[PDB]
Design a binder for this molecule. Sequence first.
Ligand SMILES: Cc1noc(CNC(=O)c2cccc(C(=O)O)c2)n1
Length: 167
Amino acid sequence: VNSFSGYLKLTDNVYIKNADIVEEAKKVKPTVVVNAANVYLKHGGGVAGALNKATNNAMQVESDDYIATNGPLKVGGSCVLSGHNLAKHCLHVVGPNVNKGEDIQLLKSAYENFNQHEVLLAPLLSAGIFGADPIHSLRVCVDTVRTNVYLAVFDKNLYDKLVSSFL
Ligand SMILES: Cc1noc(CNC(=O)c2cccc(C(=O)O)c2)n1
């Protein structure tokens, strides 16, 4: 048993809820929250901007030090950093950005990072301002992630469409 509440069960291991991931992280304080990162860990907008704002910019300060030491992530890659006030850890995962022309096949590689963690609170990778079809992102998630993933979908209209179209 874990502390996640109000989720619809899609599969053995994937759960979904209409929720603000920031508000969900603050309530649950999960072991791992996933950020929809870019390779520079520049948390300007979307999920990343919202998570970073909720940390009072401490996520961005830590991220800048990480990039200064290690250089950029790979598209499809990840790093584990602090979860600050939101979670124990933040798994920064880079899905392909369609609005930059990145290979959508890299979305499966992105979701494979989740398998290194037993339980995660996450957004749909490459959705929102990353430009991919969220229905596709949910299908890749279900077909790739084997660990227990709690998906937060901000937009109520999209949530209802994801549930009602789920195979
Ligand atoms: C802190 C703070 N500052 O502004 C906001 C408003 N919340 C969002 O922007 C938001 C939340 C969850 C997911 C997404 C997304 O883009 O999928 C976006 N929270």
